[PDB]
Design an enzyme around this catalytic site. Structure first.
Site: not given
Ligand SMILES: Nc1ncnc2c1ncn2[C@@H]1O[C@H](COP(=O)(O)OP(=O)(O)OP(=O)(O)O)[C@@H](O)[C@H]1O
Ligand SMILES: [Mg+2]
Ligand SMILES: Nc1ncnc2c1ncn2[C@@H]1O[C@H](COP(=O)(O)OP(=O)(O)O)[C@@H](O)[C@H]1O
Ligand SMILES: Nc1ncnc2c1ncn2[C@@H]1O[C@H](COP(=O)(O)OP(=O)(O)O)[C@@H](O)[C@H]1O
Lengths: 518, 107
Positions: A327-328, A381-382, A409, A486
Site C-alpha cells: 500500500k505504501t 502514512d499508517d 476539510k 511482500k
Molecule cells: N506491483 C506492486 N505493488 C506493490 N508493491 C510492489 C509491487 N511490485 C513490487 N512491490 C514491492 O512490494 C513492497 C511493497 O511495499 P511494502 O513492503 O512496504 O508493503 P506495505 O503494503 O507498505 O506494507 P505494510 O502496510 O504492512 O507496512 C515493496 O518492496 C515494493 O517494491
Molecule cells: Mg505500510
C-alpha cells in the site's frame, strides 16, 4: 521614479508601489500644501511572508530612497531579556535621539527609522495554546500615547501574522500591512539577471549559460537559494583551475557546473526532495495483473481532476486493503508520477517517542508549509499507527483524531490547490471512528488469488528455470492461493539459500505451511 | 593540492576534498580575479559523527593550513549559565577581538 530593479529588489513590484503610495507620499509634495491640509503622516508598517524572500533588503533600501539617518536595529526576543524597565529605559533612549530633536525642531526634523525584527516575541503574550505585559504596554504608550511624536517611523516584520495581537493593527498605530511571497518565473529571471551582472562585465561568462533555461529549471525557489546556486557554480568553475590544470585568464563558467550544482549542492526547502523516495519504492513496480493498471488509472484521473478544476480545489483519496499488500509502495508512485512542485511525506518513523502534543504541532506545521506553494501533494502514512490504536479496551488519542478530522476539510487559502492521499489497514475501525465520511473516495488493493497470477509474477521477477517452473505449476494449478506480494518476495529470498536440489521442495513446503487462509 | 597523510590524519580522505573545494577554494587563487568575481567567503561548517573519529583533529589542521590566528575555544553546557545577560556578555567578549580587528586596518 519607482526603479526597484536598479537597487537590488527583484520580483517585488506591487508591494513597493502600494507602500510608497500610502505611506511615503505625505512627505514628498510641497510642504506648504501639506501644511494647508495638515494631515498626519503614517507611523507604522507591517510585513509578513515566508523567510528569505527579500524583506530586510526592502526595509533598508526604502530609507536610502528617502533621506534619513542611521537606521537602528533591535532584536525581538532580546528585548524580553532578564531585565525589563531598564531595557524599557533603553527603548526610551533609543527613541530619545528623535525625541529631543523633535521638541528642538518640531516641524523641521528628519526621519528616525527603527526596524523591528521578530516583533512576534515582543508583543503577543497570549494566554492560550507576564513580564512581557509591561513591555507591550510601554511600547504602545510610546508609539501613540499622550505625548505626540511626528518624526519617527516603525517597520515591523514577522513570519506568523495571526499571532500579532489586534491592539497594534489599529488606526494611528501600524496600519499598512503587506505580504511578500515566493517569486514566480518572472521574479526568478529578474533576480538571476540582477545577481549575474558583474560576471558579464569582464567577459568571464561562457556563451552557453542561458538564463532562460535556468529560470524554467528551478521551481519554487527563494532568492537566497538562487544566490547560493550562483556562488556554488562560481566555486566549482574556479576550483576546476586550482587542480591538475594551471596552478597558483582563461577562466569562464560553463553550464555543466551549473547543472552539477543543481543536482548535488543546493536543496530547496519548498521543493521536491528526491532523496526521500529511495526508501519507500525500493523494488519498483511490476505488472502482475489488472488491479495494478486499474489503480494507476484511478490515480492519474484524480491528479488530472485536481490540476484542471476550479470548483473542487480540494480532493482526497483513501487506499485500504489486507496487511502485507504493498500500500505504501503504490501511493508514493502515484504522488511521484505527477509533476507537482511541492511534495512531502509525513510518516510515523520520524516521531518515535513523541508526546501527544508534538505530533499535532508537526502535522499542523507540515500542512501550513504546504499552503504557500501553488500546487501540492501530501501523503499520510499508517493512520492507525499515527493514532496509537490498540484493540484491547480499546485505547487511542483524541487530540490527534480531532486535529486530523478538522484538517481534512479546510480548503486551501485564496486560489491554490491540494491533494491528500492516505493509507490504512483496518477500515472497519475508521468506519466506527467517523473518519471514513471525511474522505472523498476509496480504492481497494487486492491480494494474489489464482495460480496463473502467481506464475506470471514469479516469471517476471525471475528466479526459477523452465523445469522448476513446470514443477511448481503442476501443484499450484490444482488449487487456489491467497498471499501478498511482500510475503512472496520474502519466501523467495528465504528459499533461494538452500542447495539447488532441494530449493523447489523447500519453497513448496513454505507455501503450504503459510498459505492457509480464505 | 593536498596530501592528507603527512598532516597527521589518515582515512578521512574522501570527506576532505568535498569541504576543501566547497568552502576553501575562494580563500586561495589569485585575489585579483576574485575581486571581479565578487563572491563572498563561506562562514560556517558543521561536522557530525560518532565520538572519537577525529573531528577536533581536523579543525586544528585546517587552522594551520590557511595561515590564520590560533583557535579560540568555547563549550556548550557552560555558556548556558544561570546569569541571563552575562551569557550575552560572554558572547560579546568572544568576538570582541575579531570585531576590533575588522573595525580598524581591515580588508
Ligand atoms: N506491483 C506492486 N505493488 C506493490 N508493491 C510492489 C509491487 N511490485 C513490487 N512491490 C514491492 O512490494 C513492497 C511493497 O511495499 P511494502 O513492503 O512496504 O508493503 P506495505 O503494503 O507498505 O506494507 P505494510 O502496510 O504492512 O507496512 C515493496 O518492496 C515494493 O517494491
Ligand atoms: Mg505500510
Ligand atoms: N527579490 C530579491 N532580489 C534580489 N535579491 C534577493 C531577493 N530576495 C532575497 N534576495 C537575497 O537573499 C537574501 C535574503 O536575506 P533577507 O531577505 O534579509 O532575509 P530575511 O528576509 O529573513 O531578513 C538577501 O541578502 C538578498 O541578497
Ligand atoms: N584519522 C585519524 N588519524 C590519526 N589519528 C586519529 C584519527 N582520528 C582520531 N585519531 C586519534 O584520536 C585522538 C583524539 O581524537 P579527538 O580529536 O579527541 O576526537 P573526538 O574529539 O572526535 O573524540 C587523537 O590523539 C588522534 O591521534
Amino acid at each position: 521614479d519607482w526603479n526597484f530593479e536598479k537597487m537590488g529588489i527583484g520580483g517585488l513590484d506591487k508591494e513597493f508601489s502600494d507602500i510608497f503610495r500610502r505611506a511615503f507620499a505625505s512627505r514628498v509634495f510641497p510642504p506648504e500644501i501639506v501644511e494647508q491640509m495638515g494631515c498626519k503622516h503614517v507611523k507604522g508598517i507591517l510585513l509578513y511572508g515566508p523567510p528569505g524572500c527579500g524583506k530586510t533588503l526592502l526595509a533598508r533600501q526604502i530609507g536610502k530612497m528617502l533621506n534619513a539617518r542611521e537606521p537602528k536595529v533591535v532584536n525581538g526576543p532580546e528585548i524580553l531579556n532578564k531585565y525589563v524597565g531598564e531595557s524599557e529605559a533603553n527603548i526610551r533612549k533609543l527613541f530619545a535621539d528623535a525625541e529631543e530633536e523633535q521638541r528642538r525642531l518640531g516641524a523641521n526634523s528628519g526621519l528616525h527609522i527603527i526596524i523591528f525584527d521578530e516583533i512576534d516575541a515582543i508583543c503577543k503574550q497570549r494566554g492560550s495554546m507576564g513580564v512581557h505585559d509591561t513591555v507591550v504596554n510601554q511600547l504602545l504608550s510610546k508609539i501613540d500615547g499622550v505625548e505626540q511624536l511626528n518624526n519617527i517611523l516603525v517597520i515591523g516584520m514577522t513570519n506568523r501574522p495571526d499571532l500579532i495581537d489586534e491592539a497594534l493593527l489599529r488606526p494611528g498605530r501600524l496600519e499598512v500591512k503587506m505580504e511578500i511571497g515566493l517569486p514566480d518565473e518572472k521574479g526568478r529571471l529578474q533576480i538571476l539577471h540582477i545577481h549575474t551582472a558583474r560576471m558579464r562585465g569582464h567577459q568571464l561568462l561562457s556563451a552557453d549559460v542561458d538564463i532562460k533555461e535556468l529560470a524554467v529549471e528551478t521551481k519554487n525557489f527563494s532568492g537566497a537559494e538562487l544566490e547560493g546556486l550562483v556562488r556554488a557554480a562560481q566555486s566549482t568553475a574556479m576550483n576546476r583551475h586550482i587542480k591538475a590544470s594551471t596552478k597558483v585568464e582563461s577562466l569562464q563558467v560553463t553550464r555543466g557546473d551549473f547543472l552539477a550544482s543543481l543536482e548535488n549542492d543546493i536543496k530547496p526547502a519548498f521543493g521536491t526532495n528526491q532523496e526521500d523516495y529511495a526508501s519507500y519504492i525500493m523494488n519498483g513496480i511490476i505488472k502482475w495483473g489488472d488491479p495494478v493498471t486499474r489503480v494507476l488509472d484511478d490515480g492519474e484521473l484524480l491528479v488530472q481532476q485536481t490540476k484542471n478544476s476550479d470548483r473542487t480545489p480540494l480532493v482526497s483519496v483513501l487506499l485500504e486493503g489486507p496487511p502485507h499488500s504493498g500500500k505504501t509502495a503504490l501511493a508514493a508512485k502515484i504522488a511521484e508520477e505527477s509533476n507537482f512542485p511541492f511534495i512531502k511525506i509525513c510518516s510515523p518513523d520520524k516521531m518515535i517517542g513523541f508526546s501527544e502534543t508534538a505530533k499535532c504541532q508537526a502535522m499542523k506545521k507540515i500542512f501550513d508549509d504546504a499552503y504557500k506553494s501553488q500546487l501540492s501533494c501530501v501523503v499520510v502514512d499508517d493512520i492507525e499507527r499515527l493514532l496509537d490504536y490498540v484493540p484491547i479496551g480499546p485505547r487511542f488519542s483524541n487530540l490527534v483524531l480531532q486535529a486530523l478530522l478538522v484538517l481534512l476539510k479546510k480548503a486551501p487559502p485564496q486560489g491554490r490547490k491540494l491533494l491528500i492521499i492516505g493509507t490504512t489497514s483496518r477500515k472497519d475501525v475508521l468506519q466506527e471512528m467517523e473518519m471514513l465520511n471525511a474522505f472523498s473516495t476509496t480504492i481497494h488493493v487486492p491480494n494474489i488469488a489464482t495460480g496463473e497470477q502467481l506464475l506470471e509474477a514469479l516469471e517476471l521477477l525471475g528466479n526459477f528455470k523452465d523445469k522448476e517452473r513446470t514443477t511448481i505449476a503442476q501443484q499450484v494449478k490444482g488449487k487456489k492461493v491467497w498471499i501478498g506480494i511482500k510475503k512472496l518476495l520474502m519466501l523467495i529470498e528465504m528459499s533461494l539459500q538452500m542447495d539447488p536440489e532441494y530449493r523447489v521442495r523447500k519453497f513448496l513446503a513454505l507455501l503450504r505451511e503459510e498459505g492457509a487462509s480464505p
